C-alpha cells in the first residue's frame, strides 16, 4: 500500500473504536481523556459540563448492567405455564418491551444530562475559549454518546441534527462512522417518505443527503478513485 493508505487503515480502525458501543474499559479510557481536557482548561463551566456528561454516561452504563440482570432473573424463573409455542413467544414479548421501555427511560435521563452538559458549555462565551481543543473534544464526546443513545433505540431521524453539529467540529467531518450513520439515518427518512407517500421534495432531499454521505464515507475509508469509490460514483449518477 501507499504511506497514506497504511495511515488511513490505522485511522479507520481508531475511528471504529471511537464509536464503539460503551463498555467499562472504554468508560475508563474516555474519562481519563475528558478529564485531561479539564486539566488544561481549568474552567468551572467546562468542569460542570463534564460532570453532567459523566452522569449521563453512568446512566447508560448502569442501564446495560440492569438489562443483563433483568434477563438473568427472567431466565431463572420456572415457567410452568409455557407449554405452547405462543406462550414462550408471549413471555419473550414481555421481556423485550419491558427491556426496550426501560432503555427508553435511561435514554431520556442520559439525554437530560447531555443537554445540561451542552447548556453549561453554552455558558463559555469567550471565543478564545470556545475554539480550544478542550471545548471541542468534550462537545464531540457529548454529541457522540447522544447519537449512539438514540441510534440504539432506532430513533434515527433524531440523530441527524446532532451528527451534523458533530461533523462541523475540529475535523470530525473526516470520520468514516459519522458519515456512515448520517447516510443510514437519511436512508431511514427517505424510506419513511416512500412508505407514508410524503412529498417528492423531501424524498429527493433525503436521497441526495444519503448519497453525499455514502460517497464521503466511501472516499474516507477506501480513497478517491479506488474500485470501491468508482462503484459508488456510477450508482449515485
Amino acid at each position: 500500500l501507499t504511506e497514506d493508505q497504511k495511515k488511513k487503515k490505522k485511522e479507520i480502525m481508531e475511528q471504529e473504536s471511537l464509536w464503539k458501543n460503551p463498555d467499562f474499559k472504554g468508560y475508563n479510557k474516555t474519562f481519563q481523556e475528558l478529564h485531561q481536557l479539564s486539566k488544561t482548561f481549568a474552567n468551572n463551566q467546562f468542569r460542570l459540563a463534564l460532570s453532567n456528561y459523566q452522569s449521563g454516561v453512568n446512566t447508560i452504563m448502569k442501564n446495560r448492567d440492569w438489562v443483563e440482570q433483568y434477563r438473568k432473573e427472567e431466565a431463572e424463573k420456572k415457567r410452568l405455564d409455557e407449554k405452547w409455542y405462543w406462550q414462550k413467544v408471549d413471555r419473550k414479548a414481555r421481556e423485550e418491551r419491558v427491556v426496550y421501555r426501560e432503555k427508553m427511560k435511561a435514554k431520556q435521563d442520559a439525554l437530560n444530562y447531555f443537554s445540561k452538559a451542552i447548556n453549561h458549555l453554552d455558558e463559555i462565551k469567550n471565543p478564545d475559549l470556545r475554539e480550544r481543543p478542550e471545548f471541542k473534544r468534550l462537545l464531540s464526546d457529548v454529541y457522540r454518546s447522544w447519537i449512539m443513545a438514540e441510534y440504539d433505540l432506532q430513533n434515527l431521524p433524531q440523530t441527524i441534527p446532532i451528527l451534523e453539529l458533530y461533523i462541523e467540529i475540529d475535523d470530525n467531518e473526516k470520520e468514516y462512522p459519522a458519515h456512515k450513520y448520517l447516510a443510514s439515518a437519511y436512508s431511514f427518512e427517505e424510506n419513511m417518505i416512500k412508505k407514508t407517500k410524503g412529498p417528492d421534495d423531501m424524498l429527493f432531499k433525503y436521497r441526495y443527503k444519503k448519497n453525499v454521505h455514502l460517497l464521503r464515507a466511501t472516499e474516507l475509508k477506501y480513497g478517491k478513485d479506488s474500485p470501491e469509490y468508482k462503484h459508488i460514483v456510477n450508482v449515485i449518477n
Binding site: 475508563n28 474519562f31 481519563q32 478529564h35 485531561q36 479539564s38 486539566k39 488544561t40 481549568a42 468551572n44 468542569r47 460532570s51
Partner: protein
C-alpha cells in the same frame, strides 16, 4: 512537659513518612476523577520547585504529578516530583514506586494558622528520607517569608505537621489513589 512534645514530634515525623511512602507510589498514574479534583501529568521545571504540565499527558517521560483541588475557587495544590524514569511497559497496573525528590504544596483557601500566620507554601526536599526531615521542609509564611521547620520552636513545630502538612499529604494521597483506582 518536653517528654510529650518529643513523642508528639516523633509520631508526626512518622506520619509524614508513611504517607510520603504512599505518595511515591503515584507513578502508576503516569501511564494512566473524584469531583472537583484535577490531576496534571508533567515534568519538574523552572527553578526545580514547580511542576510543568505536559502537552502530552500520557507521555512516558513525565516525572511529576500536579494535583489541583477546587471547592466552593482553587483551594489546594500538590506537586509530586519523582526520582527516576518510568517503566517502559504502558500498563499502569505493573508500575512501581519512585522515591520522591520533592513534595511542594500550596494552600490558597481553608488556610491554617500557625501562631496566627499562614504557611501558604510547603517545600519538602527529602520526602522519602529519614522521617525526621524537618530541616528539609521550607515554610513560606504570609500575614511569603522562608522559614525552616527544624528552626521552629516546639508547641509550634508539632502544630505545623499536625495541622498543615500531614493533613495535606494525606488529602492528596487519597485523591491520587481515587484517581488511580477509578481509571485502573
Amino acid at each position: 512537659s518536653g517528654k510529650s512534645m518529643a513523642d508528639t514530634e516523633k509520631e508526626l515525623d512518622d506520619n509524614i513518612s508513611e504517607v510520603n511512602k504512599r505518595l511515591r507510589l503515584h507513578t502508576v498514574l503516569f501511564k494512566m476523577l473524584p469531583h472537583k479534583t484535577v490531576l496534571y501529568k508533567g515534568k519538574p521545571s523552572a527553578d526545580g520547585e514547580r511542576c510543568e504540565a505536559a502537552d502530552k499527558q500520557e507521555a512516558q517521560d513525565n516525572t511529576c504529578l500536579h494535583l489541583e483541588v477546587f471547592d466552593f475557587a482553587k483551594f489546594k495544590k500538590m506537586e509530586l516530583f519523582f526520582e527516576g524514569s518510568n517503566n517502559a511497559d504502558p500498563d499502569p497496573r505493573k508500575e512501581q514506586p519512585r522515591n520522591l525528590t520533592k513534595i511542594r504544596t500550596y494552600i490558597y483557601q481553608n488556610n491554617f494558622l500557625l501562631e496566627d500566620k499562614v504557611i501558604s507554601v510547603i517545600a519538602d526536599v527529602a520526602p522519602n528520607g529519614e522521617p525526621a526531615h524537618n530541616d528539609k521542609i521550607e515554610l513560606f509564611y504570609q500575614h511569603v517569608g522562608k522559614y525552616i521547620l527544624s528552626n521552629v520552636e516546639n508547641p509550634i513545630r508539632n502544630n505545623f505537621k499536625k495541622q498543615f502538612y500531614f493533613k495535606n499529604l494525606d488529602y492528596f494521597d487519597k485523591l491520587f489513589t481515587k484517581i488511580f483506582d477509578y481509571n485502573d
